[PDB]
Amino acid sequence: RPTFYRQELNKTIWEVPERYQNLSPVGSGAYGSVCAAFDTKTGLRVAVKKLSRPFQSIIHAKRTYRELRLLKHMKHENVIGLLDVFTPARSLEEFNDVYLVTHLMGADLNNIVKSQKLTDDHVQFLIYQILRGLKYIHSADIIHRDLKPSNLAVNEDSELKILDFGLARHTDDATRWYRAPEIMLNWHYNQTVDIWSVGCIMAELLTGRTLFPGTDHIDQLKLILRLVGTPGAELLKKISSESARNYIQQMPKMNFANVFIGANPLAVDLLEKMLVLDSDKRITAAQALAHAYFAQYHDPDDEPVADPYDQSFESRDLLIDEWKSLTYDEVISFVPPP
Ligand SMILES: Cc1cc(-c2nc3cccnn3c2-c2ccnc(NC(=O)c3cc[n+]([O-])c(C)c3)c2)ccc1F
């Protein structure tokens, strides 16, 4: 077992193995607290997260287990994963704090873009990576559901990782804009809700402007439907509720070639396939990777899928100490990546 040391940062007490040196605050919130550190074992700059009240309640405990299970399963270049998980506890009976370690990330997609058009080649590379990560996430039967530029970390090499959180804003420094209409309308949904978000992101990277900057929930839907049209006959046949059919209903789809003026025609074609109203007809991540737009990056032998992901715990109602013990097992069984 490593030697630990204690340090106070922004009024939060940190107890970490000596390998993590030079702790500096990154941020804190409902998520707990995050510090940056230097990992002396690897020479990497890392972020360390101390979870907030991980076993305070059944729900917190289950949330902690969920978070750790997911992070341990996600092993892909374009998805956030774990370098380390630790606890100062020497036994289950002492186990009260959980610390997670990953690569320190310093910028998100908004930070790289800065309200500017990116070049088409840069868009290809970034969207390729998002789709590559999504193919992996979706293959684990996970839907991200909240994909947006703030959840996309991008380093100086434009290497991209999909996050389920936003990076901390410097102390001296809408979500709905990327949400699929079926979620906005409360309609059954599939993994292509995330593909909608990617289409929104891609549009913005190409044009330098938010595709659907709705002022509120109703406005958001109005902006979406102006582009993608009111539901056609085939989609209306799939809406089970009378009131729902009575509600959504009046203009036809716009021709995206007349919207995304000067864009690569293959980009326009891909956007048409991602921004389809009917989610049954929306392109999947795997299909999108094979689209001609990505011909310079696509490698069908290097777009891996995840191992099957057992999420049966989601259906279980257990006690705190049970979730705590399951979590502790997961801490102990952790094997760092190479
Ligand atoms: C799985 C896992 C997740 C997180 C983690 N959780 C959160 C929650 C909210 C915000 N951030 N966050 C992070 C995290 C992870 C990496 N890097 C940053 N880095 C910055 O936020 C930043 C922002 C500006 N600057 O200038 C720098 C240098 C860093 C945060 C930490 C460890 C971990 F193992």
What is this structure, in a nutshell?
This protein has helices at residues 58-73, 109-113, 120-139, 181-184, 193-207, 217-228, 233-236, 242-248, 265-274, 285-289, 320-333, and strands at 4-9, 12-17, 20-29, 32-39, 44-50, 84-86, 99-103, 152-154, 160-162. The longest helix is centred in the middle third of the chain and has 20 residues, at 120-139. With 338 residues, the chain is an alpha+beta fold.
Model description:
The modification N6-acetyllysine is found at residues 49, 148. GO terms for molecular function: ATP binding; enzyme binding; MAP kinase activity; MAP kinase kinase activity; mitogen-activated protein kinase p38 binding; NFAT protein binding; protein phosphatase binding; protein serine kinase activity. Its EC number is 2.7.11.24. Keywords: Acetylation, Apoptosis, ATP-binding, Cytoplasm, Kinase, Nucleotide-binding, Nucleus, Phosphoprotein, Serine/threonine-protein kinase, Stress response, Transcription, Transcription regulation, Transferase, Ubl conjugation. It catalyses: L-seryl-[protein] + ATP = O-phospho-L-seryl-[protein] + ADP + H(+); L-threonyl-[protein] + ATP = O-phospho-L-threonyl-[protein] + ADP + H(+). This protein is of the alpha+beta class and 338 residues long. The chain has two domains: 14-106, Phosphorylase Kinase, domain 1 (2-Layer Sandwich), CATH 3.30.200.20; 107-305, Transferase(Phosphotransferase) domain 1 (Transferase(Phosphotransferase), domain 1). It is 33% helix and 15% strand. The chain is built from eleven helices and nine strands. The chain has helices at residues 58-73, 109-113, 120-139, 181-184, 193-207, 217-228, 233-236, 242-248, 265-274, 285-289, 320-333, and strands at residues 4-9, 12-17, 20-29, 32-39, 44-50, 84-86, 99-103, 152-154, 160-162. A five-stranded antiparallel β-sheet has the order 3-4-5-7-6, with no helix packed on it. A hairpin with a 5-residue loop joins β8 (152-154) and β9 (160-162). α1 runs parallel beside α11 (320-333) and α5 (193-207) packs antiparallel against α9. It is globular. The chain starts with a strand and ends in a 5-residue tail after the last helix. It binds the ligand Cc1cc(-c2nc3cccnn3c2-c2ccnc(NC(=O)c3cc[n+]([O-])c(C)c3)c2)ccc1F. The site of ligand AQY has 21 residues, from β3, β4, β5 and β7.
